[PDB]
Amino acid sequence: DCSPGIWQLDCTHLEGKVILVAVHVASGYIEAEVIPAETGQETAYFLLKLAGRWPVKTVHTDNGSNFTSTTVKAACWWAGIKQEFGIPGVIESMNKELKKIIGQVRDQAEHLKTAVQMAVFIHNKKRGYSAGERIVDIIATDI
Amino acid sequence: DCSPGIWQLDCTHLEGKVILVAVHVASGYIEAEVIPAETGQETAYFLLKLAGRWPVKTVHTDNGSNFTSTTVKAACWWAGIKQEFGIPGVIESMNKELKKIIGQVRDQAEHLKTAVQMAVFIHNKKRGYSAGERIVDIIATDI
Numbered sequence A, B: 001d002c003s004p005g006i007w008q009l010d011c012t013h014l015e016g017k018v019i020l021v022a023v024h025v026a027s028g029y030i031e032a033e034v035i036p037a038e039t040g041q042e043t044a045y046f047l048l049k050l051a052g053r054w055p056v057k058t059v060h061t062d063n064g065s066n067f068t069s070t071t072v073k074a075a076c077w078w079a080g081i082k083q084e085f086g087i088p089g090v091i092e093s094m095n096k097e098l099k100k101i102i103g104q105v106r107d108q109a110e111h112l113k114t115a116v117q118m119a120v121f122i123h124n125k126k127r128g129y130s131a132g133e134r135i136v137d138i139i140a141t142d143i
Helices: A040-053 A070-079 A092-108 A112-125 A131-141 B040-053 B070-079 B092-108 B112-125 B131-141
Strands: A006-014 A017-024 A030-035 A058-060 B006-014 B017-024 B030-035 B058-060
Touching (some): A006 A040, A017 A040, A017 A092, A030 A112, A040 A070, A040 B112, A092 A112, A112 A131, A112 B040, A131 B131, B006 B092, B017 B040, B017 B092, B030 B040, B030 B092, B030 B112, B040 B070, B092 B112, B112 B131
Parallel strands (some): A006 A058, B006 B058
Antiparallel strands (some): A006 A017, B006 B017, B017 B030
16 A cells, blocks of 8 residues: 555564564554563554554554454544555565564564564664655655 | 754653653654553663664653663664763653643543553644654654
8 A cells, every 4th residue: 555544453473472563554664562462452552552653544454353342442443543444465574574583683682572673673774765764754745 | 952863761650650751852752651660671672662663863861870771771782872961841841741631531541551642642643733743744854
């Protein structure tokens, strides 16, 4: 996509922990958190944080059951987020490449949490612009 | 200030919990997390997350002992962050106004964590531009 309000949100599993990964579809920019387990409460909290930072209009996920809880729907309601039903390619590219980077830095960090954020940093800063540069430009332009 | 790489980071206490608050000085944009207690490990983690999202050059704090730990210095080292020694006004305005907003929404949220992120959202979206709009514009412009 190119629409600036669209995000993808998914969980991946690593070392018995859960990594919640948000991707800004238009730029490739990522934010991540390591959580104990997949719960509606954790997803809701993450969504509220994201919406306070970026103009989040719609969110897509590869696992629709992720968004069925009361708690998630309440967070979407309050923040004015809708579910994206307009995406039936480069999003599976982010989550596998993110896991590669995590693997690369894993030894230089003590805790998995740190390695994840190191990987996010590397991903977003890599340039011919970076994902970090692209998201800011897209959101700035859009008014 | 107006320099786009400068952030202020401080902890405030509420309901026996700790709120870590980052302010982008030039825009007034805020990010926050609720943590169990003030530790170097939590500060380091927060800094790494922030640096992966924004071009963080320097960080100031009202409590310098906050940044003395090995773990914090290692996070600053890896992310290429320096301590800001160039600030000897509107930053104490954010942390007290943030507490006001938190108080306003506190009953509409179950957990303090949620109320904090609700307050962050309100603060950043309030317009004549919002803090959220200003940070993106400043970072976009700056190249």
